[PDB]
Amino acid sequence: RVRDFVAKLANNTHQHVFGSVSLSWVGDSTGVILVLTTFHVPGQSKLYRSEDYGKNFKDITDLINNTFIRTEFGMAIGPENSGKVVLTAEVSGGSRGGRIFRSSDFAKNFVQTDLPFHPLTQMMYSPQNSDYLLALSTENGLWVSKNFGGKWEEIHKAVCLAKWGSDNTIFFTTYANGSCKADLGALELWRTSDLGKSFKTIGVKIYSFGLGGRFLFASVMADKDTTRRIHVSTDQGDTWSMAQLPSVGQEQFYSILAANDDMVFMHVDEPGDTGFGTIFTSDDRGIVYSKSLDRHLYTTTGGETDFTNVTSLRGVYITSVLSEDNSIQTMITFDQGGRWTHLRKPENSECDATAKNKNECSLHIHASYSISQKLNVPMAPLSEPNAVGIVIAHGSVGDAISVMVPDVYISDDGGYSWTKMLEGPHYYTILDSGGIIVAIEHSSRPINVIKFSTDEGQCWQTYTFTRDPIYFTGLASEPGARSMNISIWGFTWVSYTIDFKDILERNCEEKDYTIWLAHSTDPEDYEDGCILGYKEQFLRLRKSSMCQNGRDYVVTKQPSICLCSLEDFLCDFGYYRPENDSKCVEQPELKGHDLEFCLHLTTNGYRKIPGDKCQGGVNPVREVKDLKKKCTSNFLSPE
Ligand SMILES: *[C@@H]1O[C@H](CO)[C@@H](O[C@@H]2O[C@H](CO)[C@@H](O)[C@H](O)[C@H]2NC(C)=O)[C@H](O)[C@H]1NC(C)=O
Ligand SMILES: *[C@@H]1O[C@H](CO)[C@@H](O[C@@H]2O[C@H](CO)[C@@H](O)[C@H](O)[C@H]2NC(C)=O)[C@H](O)[C@H]1NC(C)=O
Ligand SMILES: CC(C)CCN1CC(=O)N=N1
C-alpha cells in the first residue's frame, strides 16, 4: 500500500554478473562481502570483494596469486570489527608445511604465509583477542600464533580437541597412546592460561568436553563400565561437581541445546535407537536439573533437531516431540522450559487431514528435521532480537507435521498467536529491525519478482526486479537485520541487490512507536505478563506507520518486578512436585540417577529459577539440611 514504489526501487536496484561457492560478511556497518568459488577441472579459485553491501563487486583473485583455496577450511572471518580474513590454500602433495593467505584490512590486501604444519581444522580466532589463533595439525598437534598467523609454536602434541575459552584461555584433550579412537574415554583434559607456557590437568578419564555460558562440561567414563556421565565446573576446572543428570552409554549422546549466563538446556538421548530424548533445564550452577520435555526429537549426536530459540521474545522456545503414535508435534515454551504446550492455530485456518477434529487442531512448524527429510521447506523459522515478537516459519495446521507443501505463517507477539502470511514455500528476510519484511517465492521455474511488506507481513506489494528471469538460489543480507539492502542470488550466476532507502524516506519519531506489554495473556490481572518474575513493556513501531528505524535503533523496554511466588522456584535435590498443587516436598526415597547423585548435598528444598528476578512476596527457601544420612540409612556400612 505504498504509492509509486516502482519508481523508487528501479534506480536503487543494482545488478552484478560473475563450483563450490561461499559468501562471508566481514565486519559490521562495513558492507564488506567476500565470495569464493573453487572448481575441480582435470582448477583455480576466484575471489570477489564488495564494499557496498553487494551492489557492486570487484574481482581480487590477483591478491590470492591464482592459488587454489581449499573449500573445506572455508574463509575464516575475524571477530566483530577486527577485519581479519584467512583463506587456507592448497599446496603441493609433498610440501613440508601448509600455506595460508591472510588479511587484517578487511581483505583489501592479502599476505601469503607458509606454515610449519599442515592444518587439519579451521583456524579459530580467540574471542578476547583477534590476533591470537589456534589450530590442529594433521598429526594432531596444537599450534598457537600470537601474530595473527605469522609464527606458530606447537604448545602440545596429541591434542584430540581444542577450544578457546574466556580471557584467552585454552582447553584441550590429549591422548596418551595410539589414536583418539583408541583412547576413547581415557583422554585427559588440560587447560593452559599462558598460551602453552604452563599446563594444568583438570580432568582424567575424559570422553569429551563442551562449553556453554559460564559452564564448562566434561563427560567422564566409569571405571567398571562403558557408561559416562557429565561433570560441571564454573571455575575453569579448578573445582568439579557432578551434574544431577542420568548417565548414558556409548550409543547415547549429550547435546547442549542452548546456554546463556543464567542456565543451560541439555538433551539426553534415550537408550536404544529411539531417535528422541528428554530435555533438562539446569539451575544457575549447572548442577541441579529439572525435567522439562519428554520424547524430544533428536536423530543422533550430530543429527537434526528442531529446537529453536525464539530470539524475538524473552523465554520463548520451540521444538518438536515424537508422540507414542510416532507422529511429530511442535511444542512451545514461553517461560524458559517451565511449561510446554501446543502452538495455537490461526483463527481463519482449516485443520488438515492429520486432525481428528476438523475445527480443533494446532499449528506445527517445519524446521531442521523437515528439511532433512527432503520436504519442500526452503528455510527454517526466522526471528531477530531487534524485531520484537516477530517469528516467521513454514508450517502446517493439523494434529501433526504434515508432508503437504507448506505455507508461511507469521507471529507478531512472540508465538502466542499466528496468521497465514503467504501461500506456498517462500524465502524470507527481516530488515530495519522489522521496518521491512522481504519474501521470495520458491518455485521449480525461474522467478522475476520480489515481495516486500512494511506492516509486519499484514500486507504485501509486488515488484519486478529484473528483465530476465533467473533460477533462485539464496538471499544475502547483513547480519543483525539492520540494513535496508537485500541481495538475490541466482543463475540464468547473477545477484541483484535492492536498496529500500527511498521506500522509507521518513525516519521514525516518538509518535510512530506505541506501548506493548509482552507476554500478555489476561490484561485485567495484576500479574499479567510476568515471565521469570518480571514484566517487560516495549515501544514498537506501529504497523500503519512506514518509517525507517535506522541502523542505530534501540529497542526500548521497561521492566516491572513482580512478587515472588512458589511458581518462581523449582525443587532442589531430594524434592519433587506432586500432581497436587505446586509446593515442593521431600521425596520418600531417591531412585535411579537421583540415587547415583547421592553417592549440593545441603538442600534448601527450593531454588530460584535461573534468570528469575522476582522480588518480595513469598520466600520458600529452607535452612540448609543434609540428606546424606537419609541416603545411607538403608546401607550397612563399616565403622
Ligand atoms: C535465546 O536468545 C536470546 C536472544 O538472543 C538470548 O538472550 C541474549 O543472551 C545474551 C547472553 O546472555 C545477552 O548478552 C543478550 O543481551 C540477550 N539478548 C536479549 C535480547 O536479551 C538467550 O540467552 C538465548 N537463550 C539461551 C538459553 O541461550
Ligand atoms: C546499503 O548500502 C549502502 C552502500 O551501497 C550503505 O551506504 C553507506 O551509508 C553509510 C551511512 O548511511 C555511509 O557512512 C557509507 O559510506 C555508505 N557506503 C557507501 C558505499 O556508500 C547503506 O547504509 C546501506 N543501508 C543500510 C540501511 O545500512
Ligand atoms: C555436555 C558435554 C560433555 C558434551 C560432550 N559430549 C557429547 C556426549 O554425548 N558426551 N560428551
JSON list of N, CA and C in Angstrom, two decimals, residues 374-379 394 405-406 408 422-428 439-447 449 451 471-475:
[
{"chain": "A", "resi": 374, "resn": "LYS", "atom": "N", "xyz": [13.81, -34.05, 3.13]},
{"chain": "A", "resi": 374, "resn": "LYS", "atom": "CA", "xyz": [13.59, -33.62, 1.74]},
{"chain": "A", "resi": 374, "resn": "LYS", "atom": "C", "xyz": [12.18, -33.08, 1.54]},
{"chain": "A", "resi": 375, "resn": "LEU", "atom": "N", "xyz": [11.58, -32.52, 2.58]},
{"chain": "A", "resi": 375, "resn": "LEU", "atom": "CA", "xyz": [10.30, -31.86, 2.42]},
{"chain": "A", "resi": 375, "resn": "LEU", "atom": "C", "xyz": [10.50, -30.51, 1.73]},
{"chain": "A", "resi": 376, "resn": "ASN", "atom": "N", "xyz": [9.41, -29.95, 1.22]},
{"chain": "A", "resi": 376, "resn": "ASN", "atom": "CA", "xyz": [9.50, -28.71, 0.45]},
{"chain": "A", "resi": 376, "resn": "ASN", "atom": "C", "xyz": [9.54, -27.52, 1.42]},
{"chain": "A", "resi": 377, "resn": "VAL", "atom": "N", "xyz": [10.66, -27.41, 2.12]},
{"chain": "A", "resi": 377, "resn": "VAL", "atom": "CA", "xyz": [10.88, -26.32, 3.07]},
{"chain": "A", "resi": 377, "resn": "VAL", "atom": "C", "xyz": [12.15, -25.58, 2.65]},
{"chain": "A", "resi": 378, "resn": "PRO", "atom": "N", "xyz": [12.06, -24.31, 2.25]},
{"chain": "A", "resi": 378, "resn": "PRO", "atom": "CA", "xyz": [13.27, -23.59, 1.83]},
{"chain": "A", "resi": 378, "resn": "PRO", "atom": "C", "xyz": [14.00, -22.89, 2.98]},
{"chain": "A", "resi": 379, "resn": "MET", "atom": "N", "xyz": [13.33, -22.64, 4.10]},
{"chain": "A", "resi": 379, "resn": "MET", "atom": "CA", "xyz": [14.00, -22.01, 5.22]},
{"chain": "A", "resi": 379, "resn": "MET", "atom": "C", "xyz": [13.39, -22.49, 6.53]},
{"chain": "A", "resi": 394, "resn": "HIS", "atom": "N", "xyz": [7.70, -21.80, 8.24]},
{"chain": "A", "resi": 394, "resn": "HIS", "atom": "CA", "xyz": [6.91, -22.68, 7.39]},
{"chain": "A", "resi": 394, "resn": "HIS", "atom": "C", "xyz": [6.18, -23.65, 8.30]},
{"chain": "A", "resi": 405, "resn": "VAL", "atom": "N", "xyz": [2.80, -29.67, 0.91]},
{"chain": "A", "resi": 405, "resn": "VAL", "atom": "CA", "xyz": [3.61, -28.47, 0.65]},
{"chain": "A", "resi": 405, "resn": "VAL", "atom": "C", "xyz": [3.16, -27.36, 1.59]},
{"chain": "A", "resi": 406, "resn": "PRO", "atom": "N", "xyz": [4.06, -26.70, 2.29]},
{"chain": "A", "resi": 406, "resn": "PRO", "atom": "CA", "xyz": [3.63, -25.77, 3.35]},
{"chain": "A", "resi": 406, "resn": "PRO", "atom": "C", "xyz": [3.51, -24.31, 2.95]},
{"chain": "A", "resi": 408, "resn": "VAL", "atom": "N", "xyz": [3.47, -20.20, 4.67]},
{"chain": "A", "resi": 408, "resn": "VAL", "atom": "CA", "xyz": [4.32, -19.46, 5.60]},
{"chain": "A", "resi": 408, "resn": "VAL", "atom": "C", "xyz": [3.42, -18.74, 6.60]},
{"chain": "A", "resi": 422, "resn": "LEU", "atom": "N", "xyz": [1.91, -15.93, 3.80]},
{"chain": "A", "resi": 422, "resn": "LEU", "atom": "CA", "xyz": [1.91, -16.12, 2.36]},
{"chain": "A", "resi": 422, "resn": "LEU", "atom": "C", "xyz": [1.57, -17.57, 2.06]},
{"chain": "A", "resi": 423, "resn": "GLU", "atom": "N", "xyz": [1.14, -17.81, 0.83]},
{"chain": "A", "resi": 423, "resn": "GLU", "atom": "CA", "xyz": [0.75, -19.14, 0.38]},
{"chain": "A", "resi": 423, "resn": "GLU", "atom": "C", "xyz": [1.91, -19.81, -0.33]},
{"chain": "A", "resi": 424, "resn": "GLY", "atom": "N", "xyz": [2.26, -21.01, 0.11]},
{"chain": "A", "resi": 424, "resn": "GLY", "atom": "CA", "xyz": [3.31, -21.78, -0.51]},
{"chain": "A", "resi": 424, "resn": "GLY", "atom": "C", "xyz": [4.69, -21.42, 0.01]},
{"chain": "A", "resi": 425, "resn": "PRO", "atom": "N", "xyz": [5.66, -22.30, -0.24]},
{"chain": "A", "resi": 425, "resn": "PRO", "atom": "CA", "xyz": [7.02, -22.08, 0.28]},
{"chain": "A", "resi": 425, "resn": "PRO", "atom": "C", "xyz": [7.62, -20.78, -0.23]},
{"chain": "A", "resi": 426, "resn": "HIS", "atom": "N", "xyz": [8.34, -20.10, 0.66]},
{"chain": "A", "resi": 426, "resn": "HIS", "atom": "CA", "xyz": [8.97, -18.83, 0.35]},
{"chain": "A", "resi": 426, "resn": "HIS", "atom": "C", "xyz": [10.29, -18.72, 1.09]},
{"chain": "A", "resi": 427, "resn": "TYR", "atom": "N", "xyz": [11.06, -17.72, 0.70]},
{"chain": "A", "resi": 427, "resn": "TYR", "atom": "CA", "xyz": [12.31, -17.35, 1.36]},
{"chain": "A", "resi": 427, "resn": "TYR", "atom": "C", "xyz": [12.03, -16.00, 1.99]},
{"chain": "A", "resi": 428, "resn": "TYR", "atom": "N", "xyz": [12.46, -15.80, 3.24]},
{"chain": "A", "resi": 428, "resn": "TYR", "atom": "CA", "xyz": [12.15, -14.53, 3.88]},
{"chain": "A", "resi": 428, "resn": "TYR", "atom": "C", "xyz": [13.37, -13.98, 4.60]},
{"chain": "A", "resi": 439, "resn": "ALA", "atom": "N", "xyz": [10.30, -11.23, 0.82]},
{"chain": "A", "resi": 439, "resn": "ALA", "atom": "CA", "xyz": [9.96, -12.62, 0.58]},
{"chain": "A", "resi": 439, "resn": "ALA", "atom": "C", "xyz": [10.01, -12.95, -0.91]},
{"chain": "A", "resi": 440, "resn": "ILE", "atom": "N", "xyz": [10.29, -14.22, -1.19]},
{"chain": "A", "resi": 440, "resn": "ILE", "atom": "CA", "xyz": [10.77, -14.71, -2.49]},
{"chain": "A", "resi": 440, "resn": "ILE", "atom": "C", "xyz": [10.12, -16.07, -2.70]},
{"chain": "A", "resi": 441, "resn": "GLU", "atom": "N", "xyz": [9.25, -16.17, -3.69]},
{"chain": "A", "resi": 441, "resn": "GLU", "atom": "CA", "xyz": [8.55, -17.43, -3.92]},
{"chain": "A", "resi": 441, "resn": "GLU", "atom": "C", "xyz": [9.54, -18.52, -4.29]},
{"chain": "A", "resi": 442, "resn": "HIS", "atom": "N", "xyz": [9.30, -19.72, -3.78]},
{"chain": "A", "resi": 442, "resn": "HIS", "atom": "CA", "xyz": [10.13, -20.89, -4.06]},
{"chain": "A", "resi": 442, "resn": "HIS", "atom": "C", "xyz": [9.41, -21.70, -5.13]},
{"chain": "A", "resi": 443, "resn": "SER", "atom": "N", "xyz": [10.03, -21.81, -6.30]},
{"chain": "A", "resi": 443, "resn": "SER", "atom": "CA", "xyz": [9.40, -22.48, -7.43]},
{"chain": "A", "resi": 443, "resn": "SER", "atom": "C", "xyz": [10.42, -23.31, -8.19]},
{"chain": "A", "resi": 444, "resn": "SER", "atom": "N", "xyz": [9.90, -24.26, -8.98]},
{"chain": "A", "resi": 444, "resn": "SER", "atom": "CA", "xyz": [10.76, -25.07, -9.83]},
{"chain": "A", "resi": 444, "resn": "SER", "atom": "C", "xyz": [11.34, -24.26, -10.98]},
{"chain": "A", "resi": 445, "resn": "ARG", "atom": "N", "xyz": [10.62, -23.24, -11.44]},
{"chain": "A", "resi": 445, "resn": "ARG", "atom": "CA", "xyz": [10.97, -22.45, -12.61]},
{"chain": "A", "resi": 445, "resn": "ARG", "atom": "C", "xyz": [11.55, -21.11, -12.20]},
{"chain": "A", "resi": 446, "resn": "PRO", "atom": "N", "xyz": [12.14, -20.36, -13.14]},
{"chain": "A", "resi": 446, "resn": "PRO", "atom": "CA", "xyz": [12.72, -19.06, -12.80]},
{"chain": "A", "resi": 446, "resn": "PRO", "atom": "C", "xyz": [11.70, -18.09, -12.22]},
{"chain": "A", "resi": 447, "resn": "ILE", "atom": "N", "xyz": [12.22, -17.08, -11.52]},
{"chain": "A", "resi": 447, "resn": "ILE", "atom": "CA", "xyz": [11.39, -16.05, -10.91]},
{"chain": "A", "resi": 447, "resn": "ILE", "atom": "C", "xyz": [11.91, -14.69, -11.35]},
{"chain": "A", "resi": 449, "resn": "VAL", "atom": "N", "xyz": [10.29, -11.66, -9.68]},
{"chain": "A", "resi": 449, "resn": "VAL", "atom": "CA", "xyz": [9.73, -10.69, -8.75]},
{"chain": "A", "resi": 449, "resn": "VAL", "atom": "C", "xyz": [10.16, -10.96, -7.32]},
{"chain": "A", "resi": 451, "resn": "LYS", "atom": "N", "xyz": [8.92, -9.82, -3.25]},
{"chain": "A", "resi": 451, "resn": "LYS", "atom": "CA", "xyz": [7.80, -9.32, -2.46]},
{"chain": "A", "resi": 451, "resn": "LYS", "atom": "C", "xyz": [8.33, -8.65, -1.20]},
{"chain": "A", "resi": 471, "resn": "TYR", "atom": "N", "xyz": [17.20, -18.36, -11.97]},
{"chain": "A", "resi": 471, "resn": "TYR", "atom": "CA", "xyz": [16.93, -19.53, -11.14]},
{"chain": "A", "resi": 471, "resn": "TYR", "atom": "C", "xyz": [17.39, -19.15, -9.74]},
{"chain": "A", "resi": 472, "resn": "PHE", "atom": "N", "xyz": [16.45, -19.03, -8.81]},
{"chain": "A", "resi": 472, "resn": "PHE", "atom": "CA", "xyz": [16.76, -18.57, -7.47]},
{"chain": "A", "resi": 472, "resn": "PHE", "atom": "C", "xyz": [17.60, -19.55, -6.66]},
{"chain": "A", "resi": 473, "resn": "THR", "atom": "N", "xyz": [18.64, -19.02, -6.00]},
{"chain": "A", "resi": 473, "resn": "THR", "atom": "CA", "xyz": [19.50, -19.83, -5.14]},
{"chain": "A", "resi": 473, "resn": "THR", "atom": "C", "xyz": [19.44, -19.40, -3.68]},
{"chain": "A", "resi": 474, "resn": "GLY", "atom": "N", "xyz": [19.57, -18.10, -3.38]},
{"chain": "A", "resi": 474, "resn": "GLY", "atom": "CA", "xyz": [19.59, -17.67, -1.99]},
{"chain": "A", "resi": 474, "resn": "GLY", "atom": "C", "xyz": [19.47, -16.17, -1.82]},
{"chain": "A", "resi": 475, "resn": "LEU", "atom": "N", "xyz": [19.35, -15.77, -0.55]},
{"chain": "A", "resi": 475, "resn": "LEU", "atom": "CA", "xyz": [19.30, -14.39, -0.10]},
{"chain": "A", "resi": 475, "resn": "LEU", "atom": "C", "xyz": [20.47, -14.09, 0.82]}
]
